Amino acid sequence: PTPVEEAQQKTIEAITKAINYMAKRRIGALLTIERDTGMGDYIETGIPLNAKVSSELLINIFIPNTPLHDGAVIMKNNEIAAAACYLPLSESPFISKELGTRHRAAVGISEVTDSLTIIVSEETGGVSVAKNGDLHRELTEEALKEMLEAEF
Amino acid sequence: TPVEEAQQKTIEAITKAINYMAKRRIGALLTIERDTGMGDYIETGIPLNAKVSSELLINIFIPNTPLHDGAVIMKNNEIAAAACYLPLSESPFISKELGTRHRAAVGISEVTDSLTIIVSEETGGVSVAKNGDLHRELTEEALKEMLEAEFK
Ligand SMILES: CN1C(=O)c2ccccc2[C@@H]1O
Ligand SMILES: [Mg+2]
């Protein structure tokens, strides 16, 4: 495997470990992975981190009632670019009516970029992904990891 | 100058984070590397290489989270790593009511020219370790003066 591929695998491991931990504890989270459409306009709305990824940092960011927990984390490649970022809210009628702003923001960014966004519900602990305007709910750990692997 | 503006922005972020943690009696340990290299201690923690912000510093030290156990080490105006090991002082001249956070700060200050800030989880008191001594019960103005003097 090349260094790029190994770095990708480490980043996917860090993300899945963090999401799994947050899902178990019903810690709401919103994590957007930039792909080929640049997200600088949204990154610039948040608090700049430009930090190396770790499962530990991702978890610490989303702890309830902390400065960084509200809004999206946006990742670029192997870095956490910014936290507490704004994303546009989708008006799609295919978002389950019981879902709140984190899911609507995720679908919203996925309507205007090729990004992949992961959402942890604070209500149920369910994990979903938004991509290309569609929300896929109730993912197993295996499904999320396979989705991430395919995105890279 | 740009360098001077950056130093002041960093001092302001630190003092804001320390004030929040003192108020809530959140234990914290923040070492600022100076001329003595601290790579061996940075390597024991979780890598961040992150931009400083008061928000990130607060999020790191929230109790019962992955990153809060150990020291943050700053280097070149960034957060190099969190949850780092520091050596415990064996000095018999540290106030006997203080525990391992303060002994770790004094310990690193015995073998480096670094400046360490400590927030007590028992009292919210703020102290600074330098040169093997611990300066206790600092006001906001005192801590700022120490940070400005360190960098002058
Ligand atoms: C180069 N500098 C640092 O590493 C630092 C840390 C805290 C306050 C100020 C500074 C300074 O800007
Ligand atoms: Mg289903």
Side-chain angles (χ1 to χ4, degrees), chain B residues 6-7 10-11 14 32 74-77 151:
Chain B
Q7 309 216 128
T10 289
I11 291 177
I14 290 172
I32 308 167
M74 298 189 51
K75 164 182 180 163
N76 303 320
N77 207 62
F151 281 125

Side-chain angles (χ1 to χ4, degrees), chain B residues 61-132:
Chain B
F61 291 112
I62 295 296
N64 215 232
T65 60
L67 286 183
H68 85 113
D69 206 301
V72 167
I73 301 172
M74 298 189 51
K75 164 182 180 163
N76 303 320
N77 207 62
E78 284 182 355
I79 294 162
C84 297
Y85 164 83
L86 296 177
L88 296 188
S89 176
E90 298 291 339
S91 175
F93 304 109
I94 301 169
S95 311
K96 302 311 192 178
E97 91 260 29
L98 301 175
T100 54
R101 195 165 265 121
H102 295 83
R103 290 181 52 218
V106 177
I108 193 70
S109 87
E110 291 168 351
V111 299
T112 67
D113 65 338
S114 64
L115 186 159
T116 299
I117 309 162
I118 315 86
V119 182
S120 171
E121 68 173 88
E122 306 276 65
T123 64
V126 178
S127 57
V128 161
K130 188 166 185 193
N131 295 330

Side-chain angles (χ1 to χ4, degrees), chain B residues 8-22 30 52-54 57-58 117 119 126 139-140 142-148:
Chain B
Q8 225 51 44
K9 190 174 119 153
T10 289
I11 291 177
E12 286 307 300
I14 290 172
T15 62
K16 199 188 175 164
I18 296 296
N19 285 353
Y20 177 104
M21 293 193 295
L30 182 51
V52 181
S53 61
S54 61
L57 288 171
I58 292 164
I117 309 162
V119 182
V126 178
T139 63
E140 187 176 341
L143 172 60
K144 183 143 190 253
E145 181 190 0
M146 272 166 193
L147 289 174
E148 279 169 354

Side-chain angles (χ1 to χ4, degrees), chain A residues 16 19-21 23 127 139-147:
Chain A
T16 59
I19 293 299
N20 292 358
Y21 177 106
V127 175
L139 301 175
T140 61
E141 296 179 354
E142 293 89 351
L144 175 65
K145 184 172 199 233
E146 262 158 31
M147 285 193 193

